[PDB]
RNA sequence: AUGGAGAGG
């Protein structure tokens, strides 16, 4: 099922000498100590500055990747920005605090936290939407 | 041809240094490699 | 620290750690008497000589000194036990793999290592306010009376 | 004189000097149609029958080493392991 | 080579149709390889290239004298009063495929001169030949079917190797070899060997 | 275009190289080394 | 000296078959052709006339040497769909798409000056 | 008519200037290696020298004799050398032409290529005409000739393909461009200040809409539009070489299909 | 009439020559070379042309101030190794062997030096199209 | 010297060599014509009785085929003047003289031979055209370019040899290397600059290009790796297809600068399960360094799987190159307007200084450093600021430069370049040197006829303000012919020197290896060594590894 | 030599040119800029190939044999 | 100049000295100083360590030297190549030049000495002091013809049945 | 065969 879900508010946006691919470090709007920070193709999802976009962590939605069909398959999101990737580092900061490490392809990833079903797996489907 | 036609030759402190005497009378780049570098001059 | 040692040890050790898919929160299955005497059983068969009498075994242990001091460094109980966190499974396969690396890495007799050193001097020559490089050399190997540029460092 | 099979002090470890050796001459047997004593397998080249042949430690062969006082050592092929 | 001390042997040919094309259909009748110029720092060649395009195009005789005054920047004006990139680079296409390269190609007209060495006049191959009649090893030379000598060094690489066989084979059955009889007392070439 | 200044050997061409010398009657003094008795030595060659 | 005829470019040798069917042991229900005497012109087209078929999984070509007018076709299929079908209907795709192509510009040509 | 379009621009006897509509960018690039390469033409393949006592070397004036541009209209109904069962050539399979030609005047005697007469049987099929395109009429200059210098050879033209010598080639330079805004950023443009300022306008720009900048990156775009001209030599006109071009790779294609009927 | 003087090196350890002719007269391009002003008077002579101090195998280079020295070196040692058209009198010559290039050109980059070498006249190469690329990695 | 220490030998060929990325590391490429000549001698047993009757079938002129046939009595029969060259009944016993075949261990040569690494054994795979074809990754120990070069190739005659060559001087097995205890070959030019443009997170490939790129994988399992994009388009990243070459089981570590496990500028290297996390790919890795990709692959998965990683890494690699492009013009070599001007300027306020410290001198206000000559403190003043100016010139235009600059991608990929190019193609090239010396008074107290006596002016004692772009003028264009001159004579010396020194290295280290007791002797059983090495390991299977019982405080030791 | 018959480059027929392109340069007084232009040699290559190219079969003819 | 020093926290600190170079070099009385450490004293000259300090000692200066001349071009050569040079150096008692004035004088084998610089007198006093050849040497083989002594010939061969 | 010149990495 469903590993986490959170509503972040992107405070800053980094194009560090790229043109596709920029930098994004939001802060949960919910937990006032939780944190993120995580690449994005902005050419595809463009993020701009002062967003609320919210994030999701899946497991599923190993075999060969088959042709899309998502107009005939379940492809269980519907959101706007979906990457793979495999989390690679569990960093604990504080008892309280708890951080994970995901690689989508480069892409990094940073999720600070506290309370987690994330286990180190190659599952890792990052949903992003609106 | 040209180049064979104007050539120059050394036998045997430096000899092989391109001196400053050797302005607007010896070509500085045109000379063998390798072995006989800077004695076979051209002109 | 950084110094050419035959065995690599952090590969086999993340090695471990990967074969056997081991979780960083768990007890791990080992004893003191187990990692302690392991390793310290693990250095008897770390041969380069085998012979029986007591100047082979002085030279045995001389020769296989710092790579023990890695071995230990490596392998301490509370770095085995926090650091990573190694199984009985696990560090047995470590032990074995350390000792089988250190019976890869001990030179085979007839290599003429002679003209390989002679070689591996000569072949980095052919690439090059005291005088150095190949004059230097030069003086070097010929054991020249007279250097270009005597020197005189007193600390 | 000689060495006795106990106190032997060389390498129990077959060098590759000598896997080297052991490969070529099999294979030179091999090459001139000697009795092959593994299964061919589908196996024609002598070199990689001579392989074959010591991966099951089918080869009669023994090696003398040499000390520099003029000692030697003798280790059968079947004897020395193969670590390589 | 060009005219920069950047000589080079062919590495493949290549037909109209594998080659690289331009949005004019002009096909390159050499490529060469970018890191063969920062390493040697052959400006003038770029240079000269961007001059004898410019000259191409204009119908011109490029000035590439020694010491004058004319620049990059004057020459890449010209170069852009033709409707071309002022630096030279121009948008090709993967002959194999015909979708755009990414990055853009310095692409121009350059004086290339072919030189004296061809393969076919180096080539030289010989399982077995003609001896000299002193030392009884094979000849020396390319026109006298001769061999290659294994040198000192080459010895040297194959004790480094450890080939002792190898070495014996090279020194043995490959050049000279020859049968001998030694007298058992005083142990020279004294024997009278009559055979048969 | 044949500009000349050779010579016709058994029908091949053949060129004189400048050979480069010293200017005889010129008067040098030279440093002698270190381990030599002389320090300095004033020398001209007489043509 | 020891270059090659020009015609074993596109002239099949003795014994040289046009196509090479070979069981693909990698991935179930794939195959690897050898396309024989054809270039980058044959076989790009394929290839991307072979991703237009929702139906098929996998599809890629390459040359293994450009000295060698030869390049090897793997195709994947979903399972009931045997790859060779696909082949054929993408070539046919192609033929067809030709066809109308010429159609269309014999009908534009026959409508020009000069 | 169903599928792909074409949009002729501009066109002549030597060139043609369209827009291709609907199509792969596969396709359109396999046709433009089709038109350089593999149409079939006649070109002097064999050339029997009897007397040459000019100054050119032999095989140097049969280089540029086998370039040549010759009639290649009717070179369908002609065959290959290596298919018909005649020995050596034929009139079935070669076009035989010879070439006299002698200095007369103190003046340099010219030799084009109008003095090429063709000898083998024609039978009606419009080939073996060296194409001149020249004004004073003369054509390809095949060499110069003093006061007593005599050229005499005779010439045998195969057919062939471009794909084996360059001389068997139908068309020049084929131009050949797509997406002139690069919407769909196949190419990363290289600049020192402004990346529009230093890089000129194609003329394909007129064709097209401009991007405007409060639009994102379209990701789903692909190649449709394309932008060709068609240069011919002489030997096949422009239209010809375009048509036996796509009938070309689509012969070829259904020959792979036959193969897959054949197994 | 007194106008130019032949020099030797001896004499010419006792003169002040001056580079460009135009170095005895009495904003500025950033692109053209950074040369330095004449802080000199008292000249003697004058060069001819600085293009002069070359020889005849290194006068073919385009813009050879604008190499690294030994590149000019090795062009110059490469030049004489060029094939193209030795000799008008080539077909008539029993040489031992000899090369002639099938279409030699005169270079679109030339020297002003070449005029007299008379190298667009005997060319010993071609310009060709050249692109600096990496493609198939041959 | 000349007859006994090496003498000339049968069975061997040379010839131009060239680069081939399909070929294997451990292949070379023999010309058809040099494989007819070049013969092997098989005897003939059950085994191989139908090829070798094949092959007499064949004859000479045709590959593959045979030259003589030797019998029981020795008789040697001429295929190639036989009456009986169609009709043979091989027996067995008989020698039959093969022409070299594919897959035949042969011996690769290039003089002049340094090292072993210089003479390594090769598969043959015999190919059209009359060149030598070698891998990219094997001219490195070679040392060899295609400007010409001619290299050396040997054919064993017996099994034993073969064997010898294949299982000693095999080009795998010479990966990594005795001398500097680290491969020496690695990822070059083409595959280098590629590799860094692959892994650069803003590289995507779509699809289409990913299959191909998969396809070209020899070692490929046939499973499309899921992409790092799902939506809205499916992509996959340069770092997600190169990890398809990668085999399993291969971890990589290495933190450079800022790498704190999320690396800002993307740069470090972390590799997990032959899956890479994170990092560009360049010489760092993917090169011939200690601690890289390399080594690690060679000594973990073995030699064969480390040269089958070369040729999945180059194929893989020249292929997106080749769809992709990469050049180099002179725009690459031109800075921005008010660089330049700052680049001016600070030639300008060196030169000012230079004036200042020379005025200084001359008024005899200088004070001589302990140990030196007023004259020599001044030279050396002058000289340092000089250095320090084209140093300050050539950082002013290395920072000009974008990350679009091919040149500065090839300076940071490691294929070809450094700051030095950058700094006298662009903006300075800097001060001349003799003897180690500006350019001295060939005049009297003058340099040149054109400038006056006692004139210790930078530009007149050698310094060159103006780059390759802008051109230099004639007096700095004879001097850089100065200095450029003296390069060319003191290499040849170099060479010649170090190739004496090197043979008289050779002939004295001679006789000497390690024993069955490990102790380092020669031919007089003297010992140079009781344990060799002092530890008793080879060279080769040796790595630099931390020990962190040295360093640190006892505190965070006890700790 | 001669006028090469076609361009290096692309392979456009340019044989038929030369004595067009002399026309163009003595009896028109023309650069050769135009000259080119006018004889449809749009391309710098097939350009290059008559502005680059020299005649030098006029001094071999000038031989009696 | 620079130095890495312990600590008594622990951790190695930079800790800069004043060191005082020279040009100028008689070891056997600037030691003898009062004022300076004698223990840490060096010269480049390892002639002179030889004399002073020892053989060991001019050995490991030889290394040093050595070591610090193939590493004054960036480059790096494993430890035990250089320190058999260095030991093949300083075995016979002193220091032994790699040339025909050195190790060229040794007691080897006539045909292995022969093969190097001076052949033919090394040949007659060879035949003069009526010197046996050990044949166990490279060259030696070399010039036999023979499968030296050396790598894969180092053993023998045999046969033992267990069959 | 000896001897010599030039060139290639
Ligand atoms: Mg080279
Ligand atoms: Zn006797
Ligand atoms: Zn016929
Ligand atoms: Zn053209």
């Given at each position: ?40 193709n902005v ?18 939605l ?35 605090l ?24 190659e ?8 | ?6 050539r120059?030759?050394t ?17 500085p ?15 | ?56 075994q ?9 790579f ?88 | ?37 593994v ?9 990689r ?13 023994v ?22 | ?25 002009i ?24 001059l ?27 170069l ?26 310095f ?15 180096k ?17 020396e ?16 690489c ?8 190898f ?24 024997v ?5 | ?40 030595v ?6 | ?26 991935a ?24 237009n ?40 795709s ?21 | 008519?169903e599928?792909?379009?074409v ?7 030597d ?66 050398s290596?298919?018909?069962?005649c020995?050596?050539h ?36 419009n ?137 | ?24 007269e ?9 040369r ?48 193209g ?42 310009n ?11 | ?99 070299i ?120 399992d ?21 990890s ?61 799987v ?88 050539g950082?002013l ?23 030095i ?35 210790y ?41 170090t ?25 007089l ?26 360093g ?8 | ?46 350009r ?18 | 100049?620079?130095?890495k ?38 010269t ?23 070591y ?27 220091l ?35 010197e ?32």
């Open positions: 099922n469903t590993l986490f879900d959170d509503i972040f508010q992107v405070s800053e946006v980094d194009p560090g000498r790229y043109n596709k691919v920029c930098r994004i470090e939001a802060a949960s709007t919910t937990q006032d100590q939780c944190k993120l920070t995580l690449d994005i050419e595809l999802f463009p993020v701009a500055a002062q967003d609320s976009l919210t994030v999701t962590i899946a497991s599923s190993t075999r060969s990747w088959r042709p899309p069909q998502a107009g005939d398959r379940s492809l269980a999101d519907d959101y706007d920005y979906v990457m793979y990737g495999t989390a690679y580092k569990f960093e604990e900061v504080s008892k309280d708890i951080a994970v490490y995901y690689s989508f392809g480069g892409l990094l990833m940073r999720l600070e936290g506290n309370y987690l079903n994330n286990l180190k797996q599952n890792a489907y990052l949903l992003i939407r609106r | 041809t040209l180049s064979h036609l104007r120059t030759n036998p045997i402190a430096k000899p092989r240094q391109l001196h400053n005497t050797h302005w607007g009378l010896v070509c780049a045109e000379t063998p490699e390798g072995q006989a570098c800077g004695l076979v001059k051209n002109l | 620290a950084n110094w050419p040692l035959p065995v690599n040890i952090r590969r086999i050790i993340q090695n471990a750690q990967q074969t056997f898919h081991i979780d960083h929160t768990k007890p791990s299955d080992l004893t003191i008497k187990d990692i302690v005497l392991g390793v310290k059983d693990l250095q008897e068969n770390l041969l380069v000589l085998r012979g029986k009498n007591e100047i082979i002085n030279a045995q242990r001389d020769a296989v000194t710092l023990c001091c890695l071995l230990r460094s490596r392998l301490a109980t509370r770095r085995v036990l926090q650091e990573y966190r190694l199984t009985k499974q696990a560090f047995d396969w470590v032990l074995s793999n350390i000792e089988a690396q250190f019976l890869r890495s001990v030179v085979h007799p007839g290599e003429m290592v002679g003209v390989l050193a002679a070689q591996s001097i000569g072949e980095p020559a052919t690439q090059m306010k005291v005088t150095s490089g190949v004059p230097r050399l030069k003086e070097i190997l010929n054991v020249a009376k007279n250097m270009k540029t005597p020197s005189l460092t007193v600390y | 004189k000689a060495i006795p099979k106990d106190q032997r002090a060389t390498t129990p470890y077959m060098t590759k000097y000598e896997r080297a050796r052991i490969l070529g001459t099999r294979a030179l047997q091999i090459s001139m149609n000697a009795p092959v004593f299964d061919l397998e589908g196996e024609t080249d002598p070199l029958i001579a392989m074959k042949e010591l991966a099951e430690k089918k080869i009669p062969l090696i003398r080493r040499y000390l520099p006082d003029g000692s030697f050592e003798d280790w059968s092929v079947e004897e020395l392991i193969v670590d390589l | 080579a060009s005219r920069h001390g950047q000589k080079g042997t062919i590495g493949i040919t290549y037909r109209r149709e594998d080659m690289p094309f331009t949005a004019e259909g096909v390159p009748d050499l490529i060469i390889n970018p890191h063969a110029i920062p390493s040697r720092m052959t400006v003038a060649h770029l240079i000269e290239c961007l004898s395009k410019v000259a191409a195009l204009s119908g011109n005789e490029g000035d590439a004298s020694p010491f004058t005054d004319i620049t990059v920047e004057g020459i890449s004006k010209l852009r009063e033709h409707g071309y990139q002022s630096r030279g680079f121009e948008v090709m296409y993967n002959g194999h495929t015909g979708k755009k390269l990414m990055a853009q190609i692409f121009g007209p350059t004086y290339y001169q072919r030189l004296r060495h061809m393969v076919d006049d080539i030289h191959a010989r399982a077995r030949g003609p001896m000299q009649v002193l030392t009884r090893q094979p000849v030379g390319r026109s006298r079917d001769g061999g290659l000598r294994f040198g000192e060094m080459e010895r040297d194959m004790i480094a190797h450890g080939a002792a066989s070495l014996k084979e090279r020194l043995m059955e490959a050049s000279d070899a020859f049968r001998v009889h030694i007298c058992g007392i005083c142990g020279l070439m004294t009278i060997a009559k055979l048969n | 275009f044949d500009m000349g200044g050779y010579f016709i050997i058994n029908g091949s061409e053949k060129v004189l190289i400048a050979q480069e010398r010293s200017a005889g009657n010129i008067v040098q003094v030279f440093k002698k080394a270190a381990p030599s008795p002389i320090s300095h004033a020398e001209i060659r007489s043509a | 000296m020891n270059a090659p005829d020009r015609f074993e470019l596109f002239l099949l040798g003795e014994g040289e078959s046009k196509l090479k069917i070979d069981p693909d042991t990698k179930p229900n794939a195959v690897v052709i050898t396309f024989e005497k054809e270039d980058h012109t044959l076989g790009n087209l394929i290839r991307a006339e072979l991703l078929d929702r139906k098929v999984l996998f599809a890629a070509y390459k040359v293994e040497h450009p000295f060698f007018a030869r390049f090897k076709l793997r195709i994947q299929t979903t399972e009931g769909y045997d790859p060779k079908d696909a082949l054929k209907n993408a070539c046919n192609i033929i067809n798409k030709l066809g109308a192509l010429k159609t269309n510009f014999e009908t534009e040509w026959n409508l020009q000056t000069l | 008519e599928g792909p379009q949009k002729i621009r501009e066109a002549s006897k060139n043609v200037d369209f827009i291709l509509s609907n199509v792969d960018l596969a396709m359109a690039n396999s046709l433009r290696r089709v038109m350089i390469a593999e149409i079939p033409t006649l070109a002097i393949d064999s050339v029997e020298v009897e007397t040459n006592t000019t100054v050119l070397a032999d095989e140097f004036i049969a280089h540029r004799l086998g370039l040549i541009p010759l009639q290649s209209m009717d070179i369908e109904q002609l065959e290959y290596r298919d018909c069962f020995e050596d034929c009139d079935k399979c070669s076009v035989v032409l010879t070439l006299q030609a002698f200095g007369e005047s103190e003046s340099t005697t010219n030799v084009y290529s109008k003095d090429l007469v063709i000898v083998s049987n024609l039978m009606g099929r080939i073996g005409h060296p194409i001149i395109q020249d004004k004073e009429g003369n054509g390809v200059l095949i060499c110069k000739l003093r006061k007593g210098q005599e050229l005499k050879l005779t010439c045998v033209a195969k057919k062939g393909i471009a794909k084996e010598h360059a001389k068997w080639g139908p068309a020049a330079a084929i131009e050949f461009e797509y997406d002139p805004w690069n919407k769909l950023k196949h190419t990363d443009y290289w600049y020192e200040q402004d990346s529009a300022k230093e890089w000129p306008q194609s003329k394909n720009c007129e064709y097209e809409d401009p991007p405007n900048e409060g639009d994102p990156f379209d990701y789903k775009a692909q190649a449709d539009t394309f932008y060709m001209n068609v240069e011919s030599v002489g030997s096949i006109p422009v239209d010809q070489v375009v048509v036996r071009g796509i009938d070309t790779l689509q012969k070829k294609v259904a020959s792979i299909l036959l193969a897959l009927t054949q197994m | 009439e007194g106008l130019v003087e032949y020099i030797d090196a001896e004499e010419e350890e006792s003169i002040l020559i001056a580079m460009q002719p135009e170095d005895l009495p904003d500025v391009d950033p692109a053209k070379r950074i330095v002003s004449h802080h000199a008077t008292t000249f003697t002579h004058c060069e001819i042309h600085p293009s002069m101090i070359l020889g005849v195998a290194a006068s073919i280079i385009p813009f050879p101030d604008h190499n690294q020295s030994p590149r000019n070196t090795y062009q110059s040692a490469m030049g004489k190794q060029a094939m058209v030795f000799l008008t009198n080539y077909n008539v010559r029993m040489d031992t062997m000899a090369n002639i290039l099938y279409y030699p050109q005169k270079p679109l980059g030339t020297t002003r030096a070449m005029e007299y070498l008379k190298f667009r006249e005997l060319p010993a190469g071609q060709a199209i050249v692109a600096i690329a990496c493609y198939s990695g041959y | 010297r000349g007859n006994l220490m090496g003498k000339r030998v049968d069975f061997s060929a040379r010839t131009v060599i060239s680069g081939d990325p399909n070929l294997e590391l451990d292949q070379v490429g023999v010309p058809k014509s040099i494989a007819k000549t070049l013969t092997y001698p098989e005897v003939v047993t059950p085994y191989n009785i139908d090829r070798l009757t094949q092959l007499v079938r064949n004859g000479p002129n045709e590959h593959p085929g045979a030259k003589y046939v030797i019998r029981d009595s020795g008789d040697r029969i001429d295929l190639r003047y036989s009456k009986r060259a169609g009709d043979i009944q091989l027996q067995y016993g008989w020698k039959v003289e093969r022409h075949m594919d897959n035949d261990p042969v011996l690769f040569n290039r003089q002049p031979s340094l090292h072993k690494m210089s003479m390594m054994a090769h598969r043959v795979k015999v190919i059209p055209y009359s060149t030598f074809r070698l891998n990219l990754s094997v001219t490195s120990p070679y040392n060899a370019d295609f400007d010409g070069d001619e290299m050396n190739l040997h054919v064993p005659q017996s099994e034993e040899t073969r064997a010898e060559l294949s299982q000693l001087c095999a080009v795998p097995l010479q990966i990594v290397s005795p001398q500097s205890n680290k491969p020496c070959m690695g990822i070059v030019q083409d595959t280098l600059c590629g590799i860094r443009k692959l892994t650069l997170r803003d590289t995507f490939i779509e699809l289409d290009q990913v299959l191909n790129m998969l396809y070209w994988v020899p070692d490929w046939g499973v499309i790796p899921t992409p790092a994009i799902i939506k809205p388009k499916p992509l996959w990243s340069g770092k997600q297809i190169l398809v070459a990668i085999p399993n089981g291969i971890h990589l570590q290495r933190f450079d600068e800022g790498t704190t496990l999320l690396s800002p500028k993307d740069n470090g290297m972390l590799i997990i399960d032959g899956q890479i996390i994170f990092g560009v790919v360049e010489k760092k890795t993917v090169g011939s360094s200690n601690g890289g990709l390399i080594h690690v692959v060679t000594r973990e998965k073995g030699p064969q480390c040269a089958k990683l070369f040729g999945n890494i180059q194929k893989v690699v020249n292929f997106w190159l080749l769809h992709n492009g990469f050049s180099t013009g002179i725009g690459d070599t031109i800075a921005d307007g008010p660089t330049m001007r700052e680049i001016t300027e600070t030639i300008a306020e060196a030169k000012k200084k230079v004036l200042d410290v020379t005025k200084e001198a001359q008024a005899n206000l200088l004070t001589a450093k302990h140990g030196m000559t007023l004259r020599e403190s001044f030279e050396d003043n002058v000289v340092r600021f000089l250095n320090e100016a084209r140093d300050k010139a950082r235009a290395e920072v000009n430069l974008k990350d679009l600059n091919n040149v500065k991608q090839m300076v940071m990929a490691g294929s070809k370049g450094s700051f190019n950058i700094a006298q193609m662009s903006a300075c090239v800097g001060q001349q040197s003799v003897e180690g010396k500006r350019i001295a008074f060939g005049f009297v107290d003058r340099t040149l006829p054109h400038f006056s006596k006692d004139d002016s930078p530009e007149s004692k050698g310094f060159v303000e103006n780059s390759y772009l802008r051109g230099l003028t004639p007096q700095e264009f004879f001097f850089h012919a100065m200095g450029g001159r003296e390069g060319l004579i003191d290499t040849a010396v170099k060479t010649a020197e190739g004496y020194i090197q043979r008289r290295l050779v002939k004295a280290l001679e006789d000497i290896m390690v024993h069955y007791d490990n102790t380092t002797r020669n031919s059983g003297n010992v140079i060594q009781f344990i060799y090495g002092e530890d008793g390991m080879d060279a080769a299977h040796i790595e630099k590894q931390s020990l962190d019982t040295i640190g405080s006892d505190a965070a030791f006890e700790k | 030599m001669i006028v090469p018959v076609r361009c290096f480059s692309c392979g456009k027929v340019v044989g038929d040119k030369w004595e067009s392109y002399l026309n163009l340069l003595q009896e028109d007084e023309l650069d050769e800029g135009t000259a080119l232009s006018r004889l449809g040699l749009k391309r710098y290559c097939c290059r190939m008559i502005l680059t190219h020299v005649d030098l079969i006029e001094k071999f003819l000038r031989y009696n044999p | 100049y620079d130095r020093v312990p600590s008594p926290t622990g951790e190695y600190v930079k800790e800069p000295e004043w060191v005082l170079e020279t040009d100028g070099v008689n070891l056997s009385e600037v030691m003898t100083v009062p004022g300076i450490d004698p223990t840490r004293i060096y480049n000259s390892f002639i002179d360590i030889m004399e002073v300090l020892g053989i060991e000692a001019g050995r490991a200066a030889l290394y040093k030297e050595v610090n001349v193939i590493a004054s071009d960036g480059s790096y050569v494993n430890y035990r190549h250089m320190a058999l040079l260095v030991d093949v150096m300083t075995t016979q008692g002193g032994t030049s790699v040339t025909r004035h050195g190790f060229n004088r040794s007691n080897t084998g006539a045909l292995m000495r022969c093969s190097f610089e001076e052949t033919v007198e090394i040949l007659f006093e060879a035949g003069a002091s009526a046996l050849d050990d044949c166990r040497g490279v060259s030696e083989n070399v010039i036999l013809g023979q499968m030296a002594p050396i790598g894969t010939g180092a053993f023998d061969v045999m046969i033992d049945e267990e069959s």
